[model samples]
Target: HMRHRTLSSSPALWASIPCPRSELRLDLVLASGQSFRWKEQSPAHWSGVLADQVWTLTQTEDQLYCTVYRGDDSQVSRPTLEELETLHKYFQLDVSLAQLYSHWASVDSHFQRVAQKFQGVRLLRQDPTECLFSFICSSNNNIARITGMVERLCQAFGPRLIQLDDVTYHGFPNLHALAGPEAETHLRKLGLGYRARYVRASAKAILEEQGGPAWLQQLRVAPYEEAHKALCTLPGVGAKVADCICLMALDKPQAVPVDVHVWQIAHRDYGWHPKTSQAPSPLANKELGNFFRNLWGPYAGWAQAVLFSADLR
Candidate 1:
């Protein structure tokens, strides 16, 4: 087995995992807008918080390297077995990405053309609450602005985790943090705009009314339609945001978040018309999502992620 490394009482040494670039590309996946918190620290060094721990990642053609740090400096040793498992789960590396890419390429020619350059874009198994709140900031917001809002939210609410190169990083606040009475006001003062109310209200509903994180975990095991519907019931969680939470968080691979850009992609590439030339409504978002879901089958959201990345350029 590859689990034969001895623990070292070092501060921030790299822990290596066998991951090829084709299987996981930190550059592509980190910048692909799947999760908002990851920052490209340097050329290939990406840093982000996971499960309240700060991690800096770098990779080669054959291996992915990670270094972890916490606020107290208690974990100054090499990554433990559990930490490795966490990384594996976050990347979902157990599933072969190349095989999935090849399968999609074989089934769809358009995917084949787009997949050549857009490889290594895998779905990140992000924390449900973090994913939900992050995408809530994404409503009518571009990635840069949304990233800023999320960063502000974390700094204002989350606990400070680590400092690297004079830059301090914080963990993503839990529902308890956002559902507080002063959350909305603080977020508004932090320039979150109208999204502050949605973030606070959704956090309150999930923590108080909706049985907390278990509610979201339940959706993971539930069917796609139920999860998507349950997510839409939250304030500010329209069909688009709901599908995002479903696909990115709730383990519903078929959930496709349809927006104007996706609609244009469908119309232009797939020759699909939404019974009208105008943009989509909430109902139309559902319809368009289903259109792609039917077309791409189970991993339609994953496939749409690739096409969406291509469309970004």
Candidate 2:
């Protein structure tokens, strides 16, 4: 129960319950190779816009803090109860990540050590549209470049956010904003390069074929195989990106997207043996991903994401 917290000072929102930072870290959950929208505002404070609102999140050794602003309307008002609920849902604050970590450590020796080192790292609950398009940008890209590309995409297509500390960020562009016929060619000029075509094609194809985000959102209730098959039909979405969208967006935690980083982690840490040492075939990656998902069960993708971040560092 978050009480009616309105500060005479500058804090726009405060939790009546314990602060959410106890179970999740903004640096790990928001910045650890998953989200690009969140930018470090000053020192440890991070800021991002979602659902047309700006949220600033920070955690110290002893305290957790957050403030919200209306990026769409510049209301400068207290967060409504609905907004706070949505905030918790967006970050998945209620999920017991600690319990999952403990359970994984109990079941798998490899995961035991991984969890100890990367405490408080959890998979993000991202919007399906943003997750699909952003992971498409992640193809053959590092975090820094992907972050820049997402920012550029937002600035060019999405609505403007607030001017905070001389920095201006924007919300992620929706399908309508991105699905223009010229989106691909125009995106190339925006520095998306080859991914521009894929991104543009994906946006267009989904809206044309499956009725836009409602279809993607509907996959949350569909079986994982059915959902994966549906997602894989889109342009630029391979097994990896489709699984990523499923895991992060559609709440299919068993869906593991085995990119080369994930492939290496599967082989190196989890003892996943490839058929030949000549990298891994898509088939081999598929087998290895299944191995971990079967071993880790529903939380497998969550573990995979944590390992992905660890490997990046």
lDDT of each: 0.83, 0.77
**Model 2 residue 153 lDDT?**
92
lDDT of 2 by residue, 105-203 (tens): 888887776666677777778888888899999888888899888888988898876666566767789888788988887889888899998998888
Candidate 1 ranges with C-alpha deviation above 4 Å = 1-12, 276-279
Q: Write the per-residue lDDT of candidate 1 for residues 1-313, one digit (tens) a residue.
A: 1111112323247788899998888877888399988887666778788978888788889988887775564845567778988999988899888888887787788989988987788889988999999999888889989888988899989988767675678888989999989999999998889999999999999988889989999989999898888998898998889889888888888888887878889889988877645536776677788787777789889888888887786
RMSD of 2: 4.1
Q: Please report the candidate that would top TM-score against the real structure.
A: 1
Pairs that clash in candidate 2: none
Provide C-alpha RMSD values for all models, in order. 4.4, 4.1
Residue-level lDDT for 248 in candidate 2: 89
- For all candidates, the clash counts are 0, 0
Residue 33 in model 1: lDDT: 91
